[PDB]
Amino acid sequence: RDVFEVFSRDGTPIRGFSRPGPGETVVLVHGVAMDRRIWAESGFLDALPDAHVLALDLRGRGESGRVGTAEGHALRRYVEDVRAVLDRFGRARYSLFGTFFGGRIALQVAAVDTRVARAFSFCAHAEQVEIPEDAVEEEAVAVEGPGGHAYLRDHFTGRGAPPWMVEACARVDPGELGAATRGLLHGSDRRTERGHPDQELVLITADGDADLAPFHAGERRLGAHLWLVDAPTRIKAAGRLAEVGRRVAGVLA
Numbered sequence: 715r716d717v718f719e720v721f722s723r724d725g726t727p728i729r730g731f732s733r734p735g736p737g738e739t740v741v742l743v744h745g746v747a748m749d750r751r752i753w754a755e756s757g758f759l760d761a762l763p764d765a766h767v768l769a770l771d772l773r774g775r776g777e778s779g780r781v782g783t784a785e786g787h788a789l790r791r792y793v794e795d796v797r798a799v800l801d802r803f804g805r806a807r808y809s810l811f812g813t814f815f816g817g818r819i820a821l822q823v824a825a826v827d828t829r830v831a832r833a834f835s836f837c838a839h840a841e842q843v844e845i846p847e848d849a850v851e852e853e854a855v856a857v858e859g860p861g862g863h864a865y866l867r868d869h870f871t872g873r874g875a876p877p878w879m880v881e882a883c884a885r886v887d888p889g890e891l892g893a894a895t896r897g898l899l900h901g902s903d904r905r906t907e908r909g910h911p912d913q914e915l916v917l918i919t920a921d922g923d924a925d926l927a928p929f930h931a932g933e934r935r936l937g938a939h940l941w942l943v944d945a946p947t948r949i950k951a952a953g954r955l956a957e958v959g960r961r962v963a964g965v966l967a
């Protein structure tokens with residue numbers, strides 16, 4: 715593996731690693747309370763034997779630049795972070811894969827960047843959502859305070875999240891957990907669009923998902939393909955991420 719640095723539109727440095735391979739170039743986008751280490755820890759990276767893999771730390775996570783403001787964590791800024799990675803490696807075609815809010819980011823990159831040939835959204839759909847301002851602000855307060863890592867650990871543990879997902883929370887600065895949560899009130903509620911007719915768009919979730927309706931709506935509206943994994947909830951579906959990587963490798967082959 716090699717490390718890289720690029721700069722987002724707003725000057726934020728975005729750091730990541732490149733795992734060379736002769737195959738398709740795949741760009742991995744983690745979720746809010748994660749960093750780039752989840753790709754190896756989940757077994758997703760091992761599932762792609764041939765791909766050239768690019769894995770970034772989003773702004774404010776891991777080795778990337780600090781942000782510490784709500785608007786700095788707007789969805790459009792994450793999109794700019796990913797597009798900067800696409801620039802650095804200079805390809806005409808990329809396949810994007812994102813977990814949870816990372817999936818929403820990957821879909822939005824696909825909407826605006828014609829270099830995205832495929833986008834996979836793991837446990838996030840593409841539809842408009844109603845975000846309660848009160849509840850999100852309350853969650854921001856819970857996660858940014860001294861008890862914030864414990865709050866996330868206890869909740870993810872109680873909902874059956876894999877250990878790597880529980881453990882990743884404690885690697886995120888509490889201030890960036892709060893800012894990223896508030897950032898959701900700056901654009902993340904809108905639906906995503908199809909970028910080009912030839913794009914391959916895939917949504918993945920638990921067959922037990924209590925709200926599959928918006929995933930079906932992406933099938934109809936975007937022509938997306940819906941993949942299911944055996945799990946009673948979205949969070950527990952994260953235990954199947956390596957298996958999903960094997961299915962991605964089949965598509966890339």
Ligand SMILES: COC(=O)C[C@@H](NC(=O)[C@@H](NC(=O)[C@@H](/N=C1/NCC(=O)N2CC[C@@H](C)[C@H]2C(=O)N[C@@H](CC[S@@](C)=O)C(=O)N[C@H]1C(C)(C)C)C(C)(C)C)[C@@H](C)c1ccccc1)c1nccs1
Pocket residue numbers: 745746747814815818837838843844845846849850853857865866869870873895898902903948949
């Ligand atoms: C059934 O499974 C779930 O719905 C939980 C699942 N969340 C989601 O999929 C989506 N969000 C939501 O649905 C909803 N958001 C929420 N808070 C914003 C937010 O998300 N977070 C803030 C903190 C961060 C870790 C992340 C998160 O994770 N919060 C859990 C709670 C974690 S704790 C303790 O266990 C969460 O959801 N809190 C809700 C409420 C506060 C409204 C109760 C709405 C308002 C967007 C509808 C995310 C992907 C999203 C989609 C579209 C637009 C914006 C966000 C998880 N993803 C990762 C780990 S759990």
Ligand SMILES: [Cl-]
Pocket residue numbers: 745746747813814815816
């Ligand atoms: Cl997330």
Ligand SMILES: [Zn+2]
Pocket residue numbers: 863864884
């Ligand atoms: Zn801590």
